[PDB]
Symmetry: C5
């Protein structure tokens, strides 16, 4: 259009993109800043990097870019590319990307009175502290700090507007709680002029269904199966294998959790405490199994049963767990031989009785330790999994 061509020719006369567009040079240029959250794309726990998809919103008033629509009837707005008009240099101080600025530079929409609009999209990789103390029942607060880089507080009056979440797409792993913001001005060692900035905090809660189904339940089941050694008879000759195999099979779970966790030294993760407790339980299970095995394969006439062992394992625990304790010269020569044979059988009977009593003691010890270990593992698991805050909320929101 001829009007469009004339307006574009007239709007660029003696225009310097290096100057701040203010009618008076002694007042700051008010700029309104806001962002629109679109998607939380990634939360890296190991590298402590948060990846989001946002649209920055910048608005200000330009004094030289004004015209009367009477002389230009058809055209009401004008768009300008990068490098042709003045734009604020607003960056992200918290950036964690090789290019310190990740914004696709689009056009600038202008009023017929000089109201510039800037909506640059882009995927932002910011570095925020990730707390894994109560993993996987944790809520994270990651900050996004925005502000002008080279304009002080006397030339650029930054003003914050509320973030817009009307186009937010659920992540499916993180539940968004909110995104407040606040404006503050700081002093830097470079200069003696305040530099206002706008900080947005993103609060999200991890959904625990997947982790609960894939890490907590299998460990519970395997630890429960590890108690099955306290039910096998000692004569089966398989007791050590169960404990060893369950220890081996939980080593891989420990290694997996270690590989998915950041190498932080600020606190002990709740899952780490759980796995250490389970390791301890299995270790003492194996120790008790060895003790029972060495009690059951006792050598008759190899020692004397201590009186304390006798009383404690035959009159107290047997009662408490309702145990039931099991229970012419030729003729002369013939007689000598038959008494010898009978005496040999009698000694065999005494030896087998001693062996039976030793085996009964081993069985009593085994059952008592079974009960104690079951109580201990239930208590430890319940306490560890209930210690974390908002665990009831997480359960009621995800599972039920």
């Amino acid at each position: 259009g001829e009007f469009q061509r004339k307006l574009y020719k007239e709007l660029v006369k003696n225009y310097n993109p290096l100057e701040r567009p203010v009618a008076n040079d002694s007042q700051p240029l008010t700029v309104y800043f806001s962002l629109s959250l679109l998607q939380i794309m990634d939360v890296d726990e190991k590298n402590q990097v948060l990846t989001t998809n946002i649209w920055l919103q910048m608005s200000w008033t330009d004094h030289y870019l004004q015209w009367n629509v009477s002389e230009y009837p058809g055209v009401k707005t004008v768009r300008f590319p990068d490098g042709q008009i003045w734009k604020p240099d607003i960056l992200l101080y918290n950036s964690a990307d090789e290019r310190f600025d990740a914004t696709f530079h689009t056009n600038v929409l202008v009023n017929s009175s000089g109201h510039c609009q800037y909506l640059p999209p882009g995927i932002f990789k910011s570095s925020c502290y990730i707390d894994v103390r109560w993993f996987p029942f944790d809520v994270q607060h990651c900050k996004l700090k925005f502000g002008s880089w080279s304009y002080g507080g006397w030339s650029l009056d930054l003003q914050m507007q509320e973030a817009d979440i009307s186009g937010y797409i659920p992540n499916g792993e993180w539940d968004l709680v909110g995104i407040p913001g606040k404006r503050s001005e700081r002093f830097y060692e470079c200069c003696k002029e305040p530099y206002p900035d706008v900080t947005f905090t993103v609060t999200m809660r991890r959904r625990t269904l997947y982790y609960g189904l894939n890490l907590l339940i299998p460990c519970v089941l395997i630890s429960a199966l590890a108690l099955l050694v306290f039910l096998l008879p000692a004569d089966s000759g398989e007791k050590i294998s169960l404990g060893i195999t369950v220890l081996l099979s939980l080593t891989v779970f420990m290694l997996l959790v270690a590989e998915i966790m950041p190498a932080t030294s600020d606190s002990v993760p709740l899952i780490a405490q759980y796995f250490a407790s389970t390791m301890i339980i299995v270790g003492l299970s194996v120790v008790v199994t060895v003790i029972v095995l060495q009690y059951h394969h006792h050598d008759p006439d190899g020692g004397k049963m201590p009186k304390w062992t006798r009383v404690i394992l035959l009159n107290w625990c047997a009662w408490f767990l309702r145990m039931k304790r099991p229970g012419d010269p030729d003729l002369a020569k013939i007689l000598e031989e038959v008494r010898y044979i009978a005496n040999r059988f009698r000694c065999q009977d005494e030896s087998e009785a001693v062996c039976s009593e030793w085996k009964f003691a081993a069985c009593v010890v085994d059952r008592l330790c079974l009960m104690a270990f079951s109580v201990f593992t239930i208590i430890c698991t319940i306490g560890i999994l209930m210690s974390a805050p908002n665990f009831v909320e997480a359960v009621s929101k995800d599972f039920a």
Copy 2:
């Protein structure tokens, strides 16, 4: 030639690559948008990112790029590179690339009457929701939203043309169903003017031959092998090893599945349900094996077989399974000696008879549990596999 040089000099005279090429400024500009799918690069289930290879197609009429063929006999079309003529700022809204734009800028072919064609190729990484509820017999819909960033509905009339699939190359893992399009207008918090956009939906059906033959069949085979613990005689003393080793060998499969699957908590994957069911099956098998072994190694004199247990197992289940139940003074001194020996032998015979009864009871329990576990695992696996929709279609389209 001279005519080409003259035309090129004439066309760029007083041309502003900023203004919209419309004869009347009030009327909008009609731009036809279309897509040409070529290939599907990858479908990142873990990162919810879809990579494609497409050719965008745009067409519009330029008012100033017109000439007469008679005055320039040789030439009929001209081509302009980026930054020399006006082009629409159409870009993909749902972009997962580090840079928000992935198009490769090429030339713009021009009619003799002002028709511009623009076909920029590129590889697009668009973030689309991936549903793994019915993995691997699943169908995924991914959207591609294209629209002008800075031009409203009063300036650009973004029409839609049907997507073209003729140069499409089959992926070999995904089966294309179709790619329809739909145009709509939306309002944004920035501005009081609608912004039309064109959305293309891609429907792909996963081919399940590889995933089936690599995950389902081995798991079924190992689950069936885990039932052999009920055919092993108890005297071999190697029942528990089979169960614990198949438990390990399926835990590694669970690890692989956790590796390939994402970490969403929206739903429980079908493969996760199947693996959990197999886990419970093997755990219950190990528990039953422990019970059977503790039945087999029953200490005689250490207890009495309950009458209810006998009537349940010995003469009821054996009937059900049709199993047979197995089975001068000197001469005096010698007389009591041989009497003592004979009495000892008789007591040994009674003890071995009791032990044989206990062993038969253990065998009966083993047979019952074998039958029950076999029927239960068959029913569970059939139900879980057949619960998925279009499972029969996927089978008949892949295996047949």
Copy 3:
């Protein structure tokens, strides 16, 4: 130099890089396009992407870039950088890269008669189909498609020159069979305008020495070792651990092999078929071992051994296998006692004889199944490995 400075000043006078350097504007400009292969870098089977080091070759005649050597002594060639002259817009069609054009823009060498040479280097990532049916005895063909993006047939006709492989460097993993091409031609539905393009097919053969020595021989050896369970006597007590451990090893081997293979569902690969056959063989061996162990530990009084099993195992297969089958009143009181003892001893002897007969039957079954399984595994391995059409060529080239 004075002369070359004057020539450079003169040549760029009234020059328009947008203009096509022809003399009549109606006759298409002939461009000769060829290739120069340097090295094959990587063949990504998982991503279906081929990376190569390639030098392009272009040659056209420029009408305006001519001069008389006699007027400019010494100056015989001139060179121009990107953008200062006209260049064909030839780029890879089936490219797989974030930035579509993977070329380095060097200078253009122009002779005194207007002949332009252009050799842009670069590393090209191309998405080509990768068949995996006969992996690792496979030969792959990957296609490279070039051609002008915008210039048609009446303006720019493409001519082919033979590909150059003089500078080729051996890969060490792929054997270059050759690289032919075809100068195709295409017509549209509007106009009789031939659109030409040049395509190059790279045919390579995989060297099988590494894959063979690292996959096939270890698996064959381990499968052969898995057959030793049949030679193991039942009384040892380790007939199940051997089979289950080789099963674990085979499962790990499949898991590690499937990490380098594509997830295509086009066809079942040869290596997958071989692994499936090995798994079936091992599972059947475990089942047979369970049956043999069940036979070995048979209750002497648990039943009667069927006459069919008698006349088969102890009669036919035993002869076939050439196995030898092993095999005053007080005086009356003492008489009764010794008769009782003797009767007990005789019953023990009969039970021992029955157990020995059962054990011999188990041994016969074990040996027969050993022979059958050895034949099965040898036949299956030979048949699976001999099905590759390139197997003889591979074994004659790589190994020999």
Copy 4:
């Protein structure tokens, strides 16, 4: 603003960005170089690179960019982008990045008296030596070197300012000790002109809590558990499975841990020494277990007990460990029968006595080696772990 428009127009008049802003051309331009540390993002031990977030700080004086604020009341500072002003070419010498200069070019703030202030941000990847001799108890010294690439000391003399640590964000893994600066002058063979440069040495101390919890304690506990084979009785038939599975688990642990450390060959790391010691201890325990099992299953008449081992073990070692050492004509024919039976039983009991002797000797050897290995493991672990120069500091600052 009119005043700033006029000032911008007047300042760029006859200005050449290629010219060094001095007044005599023979005096070096004083430049002050500092550095503001934000956070340490990564320390890659495998690649030996360090990633940090750093704000550069350069300040100098410009002779031409001077104006009187009386004629321009509102204007007090001006800003210029890259390419329109002279900037020092300060680079990172020991950089490790695809682009040798990973800085973001921002505006240059200029005061009214010609004072410049340039603060470009960025993420820097520098190659620094990583010493893993005392891993995980490490203190690292990574150096950053800066300096003009082309400007010499006679034209550009760098000056060092103290590094600023305000605004530092704690890593959570690495503890920052400090970052001291040093300005060094290096001469050439040309001429007596300095070539000053500024170097900063970042000193970090690894926080040894995560590694201590995940590697040292689990391996210590597993090594302690591996000693339980000595308390296991030899009759259980599990004295080797425990040791072999512990050895397998520990070698898996070592091989997986090896994925973290680099392949350097300048020293033997502490963790490698500790793992090797554990390997040796477990192997020797397995050897001793084999020897003990050989002692236990000795043939009753396959040999004779040597006097030397008899006196050394049964006499001296029992004293040490305080172990109690356990333990009508037919009448003639009947006489030889009963005498034969009696002497057979006597031979059986003497063979049993010899077997008991061998078993007791095996038990004594087992106890002695248990004591020896219990001493050895503790001594080796303490000695290896106490060799770190800062072990006490690390423990007292990470645990207490």
Copy 5:
């Protein structure tokens, strides 16, 4: 200053950066090319690339960039950025990075007489053959090729200067032997002109301490531990589990090791063949163990030991290793009864006396195969380890 401003204005008067700065247009421009190695960043065996930190030294004489130093006092050198003056187009021929040329474009220093120095830094990823045959005792020779892309001997004749290693920083894994250069020509068929090229070969020796300690010593120790299977008595019942567990562990060891090596089919690597030999050693040990177990459990009532075995396994082989060979009517009825019992005992003793011979034969085989397998393992390990060249040099330089 004024003088340098005037000089900068004067030098760019009628300057064309597209022409060689010669004075006759026929004499080639002599260009000196050198190198400055700083660090070897990484050597990749998988993808066969070499990444280094390198400074490129260039120097030539410019005819136009000259001035009288008297007329411009104080000014001695001038600097020009990329694009403002002519620069040689020298680039790496055999590159491996995505951008074919990776050099940071810095300024060019020009003296008063017209001498140009150009030292662009960068990180170069080359592509060189990596010989893995003698792994990990490799000595590599990676070539770097440099040269003008378009200019030839008529225009630009390259020269060579010795590479600079004064700034070298040791890698820690690779020992640098040296880096020699060479200047070579290449005559074309058309034109008898030189085509100078300068190539540098970097020779590095791998440090074997880490690889030895982490791969060779553990493998030898594990093989020695597996060698203990022959000392274990057969009565334990653990002779198979130990061997199979070691086999599985070392198989996973080899599979893990194979990941850090390329799939090159040009030679069989030393580590690969060593692991193979260990594989056959362990497999044969398992086979021998199976044979020994079969001999130990021979049926006493089965076949008869052949005379060949009776001599060779009992006399000859026991002499070879010196193992001593271990070794009224009622009266009639009672007489017949005791005769029967004594005859049964005598038959039992005779039957048992045959199993001792089989057990001694098993012991003889165990000892013989222990000796033979130990000798075989020692010989094979020594031969494979010492076969590689410069093994003595490597061990002396690394371990001492």
